[PDB]
Design a protein around this motif. Structure first.
Motif, short mmCIF file in Angstrom:
data_model
loop_
_atom_site.label_atom_id
_atom_site.label_comp_id
_atom_site.label_asym_id
_atom_site.label_seq_id
_atom_site.Cartn_x
_atom_site.Cartn_y
_atom_site.Cartn_z
N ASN A 454 -118.38 37.06 -64.63
CA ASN A 454 -117.66 37.14 -65.92
C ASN A 454 -117.88 35.94 -66.81
O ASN A 454 -116.89 35.22 -67.12
CB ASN A 454 -116.15 37.25 -65.65
N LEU A 455 -119.14 35.73 -67.22
CA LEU A 455 -119.63 34.48 -67.87
C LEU A 455 -119.57 33.39 -66.77
O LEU A 455 -120.66 32.95 -66.17
CB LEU A 455 -118.91 34.16 -69.13
N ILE A 456 -118.34 33.01 -66.40
CA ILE A 456 -118.15 32.12 -65.27
C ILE A 456 -118.00 33.03 -64.12
O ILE A 456 -117.58 34.17 -64.34
CB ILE A 456 -116.90 31.32 -65.46
N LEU A 457 -118.33 32.58 -62.91
CA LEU A 457 -118.14 33.39 -61.73
C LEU A 457 -116.74 33.18 -61.06
O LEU A 457 -116.30 31.99 -60.78
CB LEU A 457 -119.16 33.07 -60.65
N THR A 458 -116.06 34.30 -60.80
CA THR A 458 -114.70 34.30 -60.25
C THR A 458 -114.70 35.19 -59.07
O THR A 458 -115.66 35.95 -58.89
CB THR A 458 -113.71 34.81 -61.23
N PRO A 459 -113.68 35.10 -58.23
CA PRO A 459 -113.54 36.02 -57.10
C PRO A 459 -113.19 37.43 -57.68
O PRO A 459 -112.62 37.53 -58.78
CB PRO A 459 -112.42 35.38 -56.30
N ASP A 460 -113.59 38.49 -56.97
CA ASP A 460 -113.38 39.90 -57.51
C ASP A 460 -111.96 40.49 -57.34
O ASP A 460 -111.44 41.09 -58.28
CB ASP A 460 -114.49 40.91 -57.14
N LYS A 461 -111.35 40.28 -56.16
CA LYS A 461 -109.93 40.63 -55.90
C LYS A 461 -109.03 39.38 -55.82
O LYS A 461 -109.51 38.26 -55.56
CB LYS A 461 -109.80 41.36 -54.55
N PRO A 462 -107.72 39.56 -56.04
CA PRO A 462 -106.75 38.47 -55.90
C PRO A 462 -106.82 37.80 -54.54
O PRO A 462 -107.21 38.42 -53.54
CB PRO A 462 -105.40 39.18 -56.08
N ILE A 463 -106.46 36.52 -54.49
CA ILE A 463 -106.46 35.82 -53.23
C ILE A 463 -105.04 35.40 -52.89
O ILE A 463 -104.33 34.76 -53.70
CB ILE A 463 -107.41 34.60 -53.23
N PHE A 464 -104.64 35.74 -51.66
CA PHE A 464 -103.28 35.52 -51.19
C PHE A 464 -103.28 34.44 -50.15
O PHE A 464 -103.81 34.60 -49.05
CB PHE A 464 -102.62 36.81 -50.63
N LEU A 465 -102.67 33.32 -50.50
CA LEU A 465 -102.69 32.17 -49.64
C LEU A 465 -101.33 31.99 -49.00
O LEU A 465 -100.30 32.42 -49.57
CB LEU A 465 -103.10 30.95 -50.47
N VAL A 466 -101.33 31.36 -47.83
CA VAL A 466 -100.10 30.99 -47.14
C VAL A 466 -99.94 29.45 -46.95
O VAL A 466 -100.71 28.84 -46.21
CB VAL A 466 -100.09 31.61 -45.76
N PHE A 467 -98.92 28.85 -47.59
CA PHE A 467 -98.58 27.43 -47.39
C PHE A 467 -97.42 27.21 -46.40
O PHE A 467 -96.36 27.84 -46.52
CB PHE A 467 -98.19 26.81 -48.73
N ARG A 468 -97.63 26.32 -45.44
CA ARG A 468 -96.60 25.92 -44.47
C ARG A 468 -96.65 24.38 -44.29
O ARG A 468 -97.74 23.82 -44.05
CB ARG A 468 -96.81 26.60 -43.12
N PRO A 469 -95.50 23.70 -44.39
CA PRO A 469 -95.44 22.21 -44.35
C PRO A 469 -96.17 21.51 -43.17
O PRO A 469 -96.45 22.17 -42.14
CB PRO A 469 -93.93 21.95 -44.30
N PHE A 470 -96.46 20.21 -43.33
CA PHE A 470 -97.15 19.36 -42.30
C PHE A 470 -98.66 19.19 -42.57
O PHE A 470 -99.20 18.06 -42.60
CB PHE A 470 -96.94 19.85 -40.86
#
Ligand code: HEM
Ligand SMILES: CC(C)CC[C@@H](O)[C@@H](C)[C@H]1CC[C@H]2[C@@H]3CC=C4C[C@@H](O)CC[C@]4(C)[C@H]3CC[C@]12C
Length: 470
Positions: A454-470
């Motif tokens: 898309n002019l710049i390259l991006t990932p195609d589907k959403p990315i779901f991340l998980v954050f956990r402390p430490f």
């Protein structure tokens, strides 16, 4: 004597025919995938005229190396026809991005001193550091929100706010609270303008600009809009901040890019507006996408995530000093960011118009011919990088069992590389130290995201991340 130009493989001298095929294959957004198939077909080098637009394509390091020899003193990359069209058609003042020749060099000398020099860099630590702590806290304010001591979701839009704050705080020295509960809606309009501009440029790239109003009536209306937004908004900030220090200015304390470029007195007014607009625009999605992918990749490989945590928590309890002192004790981290640009470059290729004829592989390359560097493709080829699927920060630092070494091109090279290169590198380096001393990110399941053009390259589907402390 070298082999003559017209002897470079190609798929045919017929540009129109190629366009039919391109359009029938649905290649408009797969232009990086074709690189990989094209090089696999024609070998190390090939041509491909699309309509009237012809260019050569390279991939072997030694070639890129060589090609750069003839790039010049004032280089010249491909000029996005839709971007260029908007400005000329409307007659909007252009800056470094479109500027050509000694006119171009003039601005970039100024601009380096103010955004690339290693003291305008040190003067950024304080402006950027705090914005990255505020992002650790937004995550904190979400973990204690889902309730079970974690956070799941797609943080892309938070990556935008983070970024737009970062580029705004460095050019204006004022905070905007894009990491608040309720953000500015005028600033979300500009952010989604920058990404709307991009997205609507694709269908406009292989069609004559002065034919937009007939074969591309809609995409052109939208792309014209997105630039309008970009201009007015960047123009607003530039007024209400000119006037933010125009009166109340009886002391010291930053680099305020807007201020410095008014105090150095080496640039006319006309251009500061334009250049700032372009810088502002550059911070919004580029860092965002890249940071997203780094996190993505850290979740793909925990063992690497931990090595980075070890070196970040090692330049903390073994520097005791603030952030400044530890920014030189994190090589694996910085290398981590290059290993990201490797796997996920913003720029699909780098292009240069050669000042004078030269020969690549064994073919004559007439001066003034668009030659292109398949950055995306070079990243994935196993002929350049052992196991190019693996995320391996150690690639960019071994220096002992290497007989050859290539430098990372995500930012381009030579005197007309990314003027925002340095800002971006530091901005991402800090964000990661903080993310690294705070969260052990993962992903809810097997991660299988691919890139889209898309002019710049991006990932195609959403990315779901998980954050956990430490
Ligand atoms: C990870 C973030 C970023 C990457 C990978 C990136 C990448 C690059 C690339 C590859 C180019 C073309 C290089 C070439 O022609 O050799 C470029 C142009 C440029 N980018 Fe960036 N950039 C991003 C961040 C920024 C930032 C934050 C800004 C604004 C501060 C921005 C504004 C610029 C401008 C205005 C130039 C044109 C410079 C010129 O032609 O003199 N980019 N960038
Ligand atoms: C005003 C802003 C657009 C500045 C954005 C800039 O920070 C950056 C993301 C831009 C500037 C030059 C751009 C390149 C210009 C031309 C090429 C060839 C084209 O065929 C694919 C896109 C590609 C590879 C572009 C990728 C996006 C780049 C690298």
């Amino acid at each position: 004597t070298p082999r003559p130009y017209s002897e470079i493989p190609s798929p045919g001298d017929n540009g129109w025919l190629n366009l039919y095929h391109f359009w029938r294959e649905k290649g408009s957004q797969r232009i990086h995938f074709r690189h990989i198939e094209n090089f696999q077909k024609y070998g190390p080098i090939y041509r491909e005229k699309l309509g009237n637009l012809e260019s050569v394509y390279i991939i072997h390091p030694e070639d890129v190396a060589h090609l750069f020899k003839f790039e010049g003193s004032y280089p010249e990359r491909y000029d996005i026809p839709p971007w260029l069209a908007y400005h000329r058609y409307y007659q909007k003042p252009i800056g470094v991005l479109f500027k050509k020749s000694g006119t171009w060099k003039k601005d970039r000398v100024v601009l380096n001193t103010e955004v690339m020099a290693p003291e305008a860099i040190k003067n950024f630590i304080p402006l950027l550091n705090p914005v990255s702590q505020d992002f650790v806290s937004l995550l904190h304010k979400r973990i204690k929100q889902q309730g079970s001591g974690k956070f799941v979701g797609d943080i892309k839009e938070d990556l935008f706010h983070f970024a737009f704050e970062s580029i705004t705080n460095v050019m204006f020295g004022e905070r905007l609270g894009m990491l608040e509960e309720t953000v500015n809606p005028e600033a979300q309009k500009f952010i989604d303008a920058v990404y709307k501009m991009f997205h609507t440029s694709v269908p406009l790239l292989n069609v004559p600009p002065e034919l937009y109003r007939l074969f591309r009536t809609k995409t052109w209306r939208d792309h014209v809009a997105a630039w309008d937004t970009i201009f007015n908004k960047a123009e607003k900030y530039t007024e209400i901040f000119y006037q933010d220090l125009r009166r109340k200015t009886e002391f010291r304390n930053y680099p305020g890019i807007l201020y410095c470029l008014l105090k150095s007195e080496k640039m006319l007014l006309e251009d500061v507006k334009a250049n700032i607009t372009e810088m502002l625009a550059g911070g919004v999605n580029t860092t965002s996408m890249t940071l997203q992918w780094h996190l993505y990749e850290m979740a793909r490989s925990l063992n690497v995530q931990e090595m980075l945590r070890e070196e970040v928590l090692n330049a903390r309890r073994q520097a005791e000093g603030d952030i400044s002192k530890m920014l030189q004790m994190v090589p694996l981290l910085k290398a981590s960011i290059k290993e990201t640009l490797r796997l996920h470059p913003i720029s699909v290729t780098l292009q240069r118009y050669p000042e004078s004829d030269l020969v690549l592989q064994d073919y004559l390359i007439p001066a003034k011919t668009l030659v292109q560097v398949a950055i995306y493709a070079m990243g994935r080829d196993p002929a350049f990088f052992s196991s190019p699927d693996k995320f391996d920060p150690t690639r960019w630092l071994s220096k002992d069992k290497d007989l050859i070494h290539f430098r990372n091109l995500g930012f381009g090279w030579g005197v007309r590389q990314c003027v925002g290169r340095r800002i971006a590198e530091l901005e991402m380096t800090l964000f990661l130290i903080h993310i690294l001393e705070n969260f052990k990110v993962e992903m809810q399941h097997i991660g299988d995201v691919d890139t889209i053009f898309n002019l710049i390259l991006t990932p195609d589907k959403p990315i779901f991340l998980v954050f956990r402390p430490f």
